[PDB]
């Protein structure tokens, strides 16, 4: 997936992403939601894309209260047969902001 530079951005910012497997650590990456796609990078320069997701197929949901994953403010984006993304926002305000935007893209 390629990002269109001259396209408006719905929201962008830091999120923590859990490793698919391994020691299951949280990596802080810079995320950008442009169009119905989610792109992420190393930092806020938004220079080289590290990964991307076509949201319309996905289901994105809050893991609920209580830090059940070991961190507060986590949510999960999944769709059977595709890669699951486990994400964490820094604050409730950031989580709400991301959930609202990601909902609009997926639908
Ligand atoms: O090298 P180890 O110790 O195994 O951990 C890797 C790196 O942190 C990768 O980032 P980078 O290669 O850019 O430093 C990351 O991919 P991302 O860069 O896409 O975040 C992987 O997360 P996954 O998305 O689960 O593969 C994670 O498993």
Curated annotation (Swiss-Prot):
Protein name: Pleckstrin homology domain-containing family A member 4
Function: Binds specifically to phosphatidylinositol 3-phosphate (PtdIns3P), but not to other phosphoinositides.
Tissues in which the protein is found: Highly expressed in melanoma. Detected at low levels in heart, skeletal muscle, kidney, liver and small intestine.
Highest taxon above the source species: Eukaryota
Domain PH positions: 8-107
Record's subcellular location: Cytoplasm; Membrane
Origin species: Homo sapiens
């Amino acid at each position: 997936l390629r990002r269109d530079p001259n396209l408006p951005v719905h929201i962008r910012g830091w999120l923590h992403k859990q490793d698919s497997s391994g020691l299951r650590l949280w990596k802080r990456r810079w995320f950008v939601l442009s169009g119905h796609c989610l792109f992420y990078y190393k930092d806020s320069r938004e220079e080289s894309v590290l990964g991307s997701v076509l949201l319309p197929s996905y289901n994105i949901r809050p893991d609920g209260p209580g830090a059940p994953r070991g961190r507060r403010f986590t949510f999960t984006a999944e769709h059977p047969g595709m890669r699951t993304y486990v994400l964490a926002a820094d604050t409730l305000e950031d989580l709400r902001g991301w959930l609202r935007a990601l909902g609009r893209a997926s639908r």
